[PDB]
Every structure is written in structure tokens, then in C-alpha cells.
Ligand binder design. Structure first.
Ligand code: HEM
Ligand SMILES: O=C(NO)c1ccccc1
Ligand SMILES: [Ca+2]
Ligand SMILES: [Ca+2]
Length: 308
């Protein structure tokens, strides 16, 4: 069955607004919630498709993807998802899936943060289990080379250059832990020297935030220009060698960036072009092997599988 943005138009016409209201309220106390939620959707989609598998807690028949490298002590916003689900279950009992709810949340988070607005295709259902081993192998790492980032995306069906470059724009807001850039700052690639593609003046600033013996969990803004605004500032930074993580700067400085550089240049000088590409990439990502029809279920509680 094909996903459609009109899926809940009759069964729960107000799910969108309920989701938005929840985020709007949380934003007051947590300015970063919008970035965390968009990332939860991405982490979900890349492991067995967008089926809300990342939301499941540990059970005795399978381990949680929340423990996966990249997710453990990194992913967040779960109790917020719990709140959205409860509000929606009240208005529309057993109607909206966690997988679809997380998809709308990601979209509203982008819009609320100043990004484009669009109706995401819906109709996805929830998985009956989590896949930790798959997560540990399918999620791209910050130390990946351009070709490795490409293999990683092609692996789940996103075999276009615009997919990698456009979705990477998700790093236009949010934070990153010092621990993930330490090598770029003090000993890159076992050379005892910092990454040569890192702006030297910016390297000073970064070394100040992430001292060699400091707190590895200290957070740093992904986008030094507009840290919380969803815009194309992320691509401008790359052009100045100010991409925060290796996988970031590689889109512009890697010797394999022949096909990505033109897209960086383009997105950096046109918000409309970037937003179009982002919406198109997002919908494509939201379409990775989804459960539909009778497959999977509609979780009452996103943290656990329905007993029946
Ligand atoms: C190209 C491969 C990618 C790599 C290697 C990667 C790596 C990372 C890393 C290292 C962090 C920080 C983790 C932490 O400090 O706890 C992170 C955070 C984040 N990523 Fe990515 N990422 C990738 C793709 C994406 C995509 C496609 C999106 C989705 C649009 C995305 C959205 C985000 C957001 C918004 C955050 C910050 C979340 C928060 O502040 O809570 N990432 N990513
Ligand atoms: O966000 C990640 N993958 O999408 C990630 C983050 C840190 C380490 C490994 C992977
Ligand atoms: Ca999943
Ligand atoms: Ca920004």
C-alpha cells in the first residue's frame, strides 16, 4: 500500500495540530527539542525503515536500539513522544501509529524551527521488535569518508547525491558532543595534528569548548551562524571549512566531493532550492520499507508492543 498525506484526514483530522501544540509547549522549556525529534525520525528510518523501532524499550526477547552506538547517551526526547501519543490516543483511540506520529513530529519540528512546511505522506505501522545489531551497522558514523557516507545512504535506498547533501542539512540546528570531534582537533588520523580541512580560527574556538582533558560530553552547536534556526547557513559554513564534524566537511572538502560540491554551492546560495531538496529527500527517507496494511500494528504505548 502506498503512503498518502491524506491518511488520517477522516479518522483523525487534528493529529497534526495536537503534535504541533505539544512541541510548541516543550520548546518553551527545551529550545533543542525540535532538533532532537527530527533526529529521532532519521535514526528510526535508517534501521528497518520508519517503523518506530527506536522507540521500543528493552525486553527479554530483544534489546533496545536506544543502546546502539550513536543512540546510547545521545538520542533524546522520548517522554515528549509519550506525551504526543497520549494526547492523540485520547482524541483518536488506536488510530495513529507511533511511526507516523514520529514522522509528523519531525516535520512540525522543522517548520516550527523556521523550515519549510509540507504534508508528510502517512499510513505507516509499528514494528513488533527492535534491531540493535542492525542499528549498529546501518547508522552512519561521523568518521565515515564521503564514499562511506554514500554507501551507507544507498544501502537504505537513498542512492542520490541530493539525498545525502540535502538531508545532511539537518545539521543546520542541534548540538554535538565534544567526544565526536576530539580527533579533528588534536590528533586527526593518527597524525598528531588537527584536521587540515578545519578553519584554523574556528579550531581555536572549538579547542576552547573542548579542552584536551575536558568534559567529553560537553555540547557544541552544529551551526555556528544560526544554532537553532532551520536554514541553509549550514552550507555556507562548509564553504569556509567550518563544518563541525568530519562527515559534515567532507561534503565539500573530500577528494570524492565532485558531485556534492555543486549541490553545496547551490544550497548555500538559495533557501528555496535547499528547502525543496530537503522536503523531497525527507519524503524519500520516510518511504524506506514501511509496514502498511495489516503488517505491524498501531501501538497504544510507543515504548512497548501491544499484548493483544
Ligand atoms: C551523514 C551522516 C550523519 C552522521 C554521521 C551524523 C552524526 C551525528 C552526530 C555525531 C550527532 C551528535 C551526537 C551527540 O553529540 O550526541 C548528530 C546529531 C544530530 N543529527 Fe546527525 N548525522 C548524520 C545525518 C543526519 C541526518 C540525515 C539528520 C536528519 C535530518 C540528522 C539530524 C541531526 C540532528 C538535528 C542532530 C542534533 C540532535 C540534538 O541536538 O538532539 N543527522 N548527528
Ligand atoms: O547520529 C549517528 N548516526 O546517524 C551517529 C552518532 C555518533 C556515532 C555514530 C553514529
Ligand atoms: Ca526503524
Ligand atoms: Ca541554522
Amino acid at each position: 500500500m502506498q503512503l498518502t498525506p491524506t491518511f488520517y484526514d477522516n479518522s483523525c483530522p487534528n493529529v497534526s495540530n495536537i503534535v504541533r501544540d505539544t512541541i510548541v509547549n516543550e520548546l518553551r522549556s527545551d529550545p533543542r527539542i525540535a532538533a532532537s525529534i527530527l533526529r529521532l525520525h532519521f535514526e528510526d528510518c535508517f534501521v528497518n525503515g520508519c517503523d518506530a523501532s527506536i522507540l521500543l524499550d528493552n525486553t527479554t526477547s530483544f534489546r533496545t536500539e536506544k543502546d546502539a552506538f550513536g543512540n546510547a547517551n545521545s538520542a533524546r526526547g522520548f517522554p515528549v513522544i509519550d506525551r504526543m501519543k497520549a494526547a492523540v490516543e485520547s482524541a483518536c483511540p488506536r488510530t495513529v501509529s507511533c511511526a507516523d506520529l514520529l514522522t509528523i513530529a519531525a516535520q512540525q519540528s522543522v517548520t516550527l524551527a523556521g523550515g519549510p512546511s509540507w504534508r508528510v505522506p502517512l499510513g505507516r505501522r509499528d514494528s513488533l521488535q527492535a534491531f540493535l545489531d542492525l542499528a549498529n551497522a546501518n547508522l552512519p558514523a561521523p568518521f565515515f569518508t564521503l564514499p562511506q557516507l554514500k554507501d551507507s545512504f544507498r544501502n537504505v535506498g537513498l542512492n542520490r547525491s541530493s539525498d545525502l547533501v540535502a538531508l545532511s542539512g539537518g545539521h543546520t540546528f542541534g548540538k554535538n558532543q565534544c567526544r565526536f570531534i576530539m580527533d579533528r582537533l588534536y590528533n586527526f588520523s593518527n597524525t598528531g595534528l588537527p584536521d587540515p580541512t578545519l578553519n584554523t580560527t574556528y579550531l581555536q574556538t572549538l579547542r576552547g569548548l573542548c579542552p584536551l582533558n575536558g568534559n567529553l560530553s560537553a555540547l557544541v552547536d552544529f551551526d555556528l551562524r544560526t544554532p537553532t534556526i532551520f536554514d541553509n547557513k549550514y552550507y555556507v559554513n562548509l564553504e569556509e571549512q567550518k563544518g563541525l564534524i568530519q562527515s559534515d566537511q567532507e561534503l565539500f572538502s573530500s577528494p570524492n566531493a565532485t558531485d556534492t560540491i555543486p549541490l553545496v554551492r547551490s544550497f548555500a546560495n538559495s533557501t528555496q532550492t535547499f528547502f525543496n531538496a530537503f522536503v523531497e529527500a525527507m519524503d524519500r527517507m520516510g518511504n524506506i520499507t514501511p509496514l502498511t496494511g495489516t503488517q505491524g500494528q498501531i501501538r497504544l504505548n510507543c515504548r512497548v508492543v501491544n499484548s493483544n
